[PDB]
């Protein structure tokens, strides 16, 4: 649509959004698969964080393809996860970083004042540091979650390391590229017609 | 025969701080459209004159 409303529900910056939109313009299909299943991947973290800002049918919720990982039983143990791209397709991995409105929230959720997030792959490397600041409210949030992504080539490995503030990948997409497809911005009605 | 087929082409999004790219992209599209419109119309006028003279 020329004016979509359902985009980022937990306000933040989407890194390289325009480049991703361009890359997804040649994708004809994909497999949505669970990259890091929440049920078995994090036994020592809470995988149930939600936000009112992502409310669905009246209940607080969160992004379907991401997990908000907060501490458990007063601790926030160091995370280390990896994935090997055995799909024989490029894989799009999405994740994010939480930037609390204040230090009270940072301690309450991650039990550290010095969290970091580190994501690497053979040809990718980023380290993120949460930047705590009280921001103007957007969708009632004084904090923010930024979103990041990368593509894995077949056979590579991606590693996620953190001691707090990570919004972990849950689902990822195995991208099958085609040709001649693209993205249309339009309000035209949909029908059962066929055209060349 | 001398005018080729138009193949899939879609627009691009740009950020707030990418205005110079946005403007170049538009400039390129408008320039090519203005040129092809010129060529299509001129060719038709030139050939319509010759057709009538031929007859």
């Amino acid at each position: 649509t020329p004016n979509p409303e359902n985009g980022t529900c937990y306000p933040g910056y989407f890194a390289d959004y325009e480049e991703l939109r361009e890359q997804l313009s040649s994708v004809s299909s994909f497999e949505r698969f669970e990259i890091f299943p929440k049920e078995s991947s994090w036994p020592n973290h809470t995988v149930t964080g939600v936000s009112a800002s992502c409310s669905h049918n009246g209940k607080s919720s969160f992004y379907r393809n991401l997990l908000w990982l907060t501490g458990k039983n007063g601790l926030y143990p160091n995370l280390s996860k990896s994935y090997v791209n055995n799909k024989e397709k490029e894989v799009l991995v999405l994740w994010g970083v939480h930037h609390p409105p204040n230090i009270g929230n940072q301690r309450a959720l991650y039990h550290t004042e010095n969290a970091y997030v580190s994501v690497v792959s053979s040809h990718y490397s980023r380290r993120f540091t949460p930047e705590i600041a009280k921001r103007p409210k957007v969708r009632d949030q004084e904090g923010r979650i930024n979103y990041y992504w990368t593509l894995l080539e077949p056979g590579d490995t991606i590693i996620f390391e953190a001691n707090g503030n990570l919004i972990a990948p849950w689902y990822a997409f195995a991208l099958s590229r085609g040709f001649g497809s693209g993205i249309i911005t339009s309000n035209a009605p949909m029908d059962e017609c066929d055209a060349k | 025969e001398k005018m080729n087929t138009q193949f899939t082409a879609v627009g691009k999004e740009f950020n707030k701080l990418e205005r110079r790219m946005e403007n170049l992209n538009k400039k390129v599209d408008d320039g090519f459209l203005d040129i092809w419109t010129y060529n299509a119309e001129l060719l038709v006028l030139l050939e319509n004159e010759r057709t009538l003279d031929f007859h």
Epitope: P2, N3, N187 | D29, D30
Partner: antibody, heavy 126, light 107 residues
Framework: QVQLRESGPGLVKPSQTLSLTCTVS??????????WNWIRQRPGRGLEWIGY???????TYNPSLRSRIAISLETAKNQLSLRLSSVSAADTAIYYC??????????????????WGQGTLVTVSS | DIQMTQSPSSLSASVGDRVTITCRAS??????LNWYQQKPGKAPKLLIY???TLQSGVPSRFSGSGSRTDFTLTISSLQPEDFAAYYC?????????FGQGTRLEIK
């Protein structure tokens, strides 16, 4: 020259369906390939778009009223029609029909409303 | 829906003066902006078609221009017959919208 003329009761009772007709002359709603619009103006307010119908019967509506609005078209008589179910006080307005014309531009056809009709005032009361 | 905001809501100026009415879109609508003149009791008349062009029959005193979001309607040498409400319309998206309108009073 192109002329549009709206017509209808001018008075509808609450919970009745309002039905207006626009007769198009000096043009052809089976040949032009244009969109035919309905708009309204509540007294004291600016203009609000209702919806439009194309030559192929393809119809779009203002999403705030889409559940109530029906728009149709009869090419044989050059007539457009508008129906609003469950009419209430909020629907008092001058209703207008309009022709949407165009000139090709950079970015596609650049559309505008040129022939606007006269306007029919409809009061909702009992 | 793309919102159109006009400013001022009301303007008065004497005959022969210059009137500038502006309109701001919430979204980039490129050149898809029409301007209309509404005399009391009548359907609106088209003045400006492309953001910068006139409809045949429109007096040369009317002009306008604009870019992505910021557009202007200008009346040079204002005459008594120019008393009207003026409206800003976008034709870029489907849920067509008009601004709230500007009432132009004379003197």
């Amino acid at each position: 020259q192109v002329q549009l003329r709206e017509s209808g009761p001018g008075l509808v009772k609450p919970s009745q369906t309002l039905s207006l007709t626009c007769t198009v002359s000096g043009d052809s709603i089976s040949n032009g390939g244009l969109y035919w619009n309905w708009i309204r103006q509540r007294p004291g307010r600016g203009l609000e778009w209702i919806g439009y119908i194309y030559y192929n019967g393809v119809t779009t509506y203002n999403p705030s009223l889409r559940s109530r609005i029906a728009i149709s078209l009869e090419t044989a008589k050059n007539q457009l029609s508008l129906r609003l179910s469950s009419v209430s006080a909020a629907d008092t307005a001058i209703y207008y029909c309009a022709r949407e014309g165009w000139v090709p531009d950079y970015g596609g056809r650049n559309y505008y409303l040129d022939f606007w009709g006269q306007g029919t005032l409809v009061t909702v009361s009992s | 829906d793309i919102q159109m905001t006009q400013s001022p809501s009301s303007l008065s100026a004497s005959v022969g003066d210059r009137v500038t009415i502006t309109c701001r879109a919430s979204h980039n609508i490129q050149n898809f902006l029409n301007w209309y003149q509404q005399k009391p009791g009548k359907a609106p008349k088209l003045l400006i078609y492309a953001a910068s062009t006139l409809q045949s029959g429109v007096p040369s005193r009317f002009s306008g221009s604009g870019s992505r979001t910021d557009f202007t309607l200008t009346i040079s040498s204002l005459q008594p017959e120019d008393f009207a409400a003026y409206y800003c319309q976008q034709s870029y998206g489907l849920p067509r919208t008009f601004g709230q309108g500007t009432r132009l009073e004379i003197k």
